[PDB]
Design a protein around this nucleic acid. Structure first.
Length: 59
DNA sequence: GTGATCAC
DNA sequence: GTGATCAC
């Protein structure tokens, strides 16, 4: 899914930013919770990075 | 190790 | 084909 709501992330370049993830999904093995993951673009570098989403962020 | 995703 | 993303 593409996300709508912004997320507080630490960028690879070291900054606090609020970014809307371009894709989001659940990353979990069988029997365990895992995490939710967002695909983000650092607007300072144009570089792509992944980052944990809050547990209640909608997929 | 396991899970999904995709820019590189 | 894989790095890198986390929590268990």
């Amino acid at each position: 899914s593409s996300g709508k709501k912004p997320v507080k992330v630490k960028t690879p370049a070291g900054k606090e930013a609020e970014l809307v993830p371009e894709k989001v999904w659940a990353l979990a093995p069988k029997g365990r919770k895992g995490v939710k993951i967002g695909l983000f673009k650092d607007p300072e570098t144009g570089k792509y990075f992944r980052h944990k989403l809050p547990d209640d962020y909608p997929i």
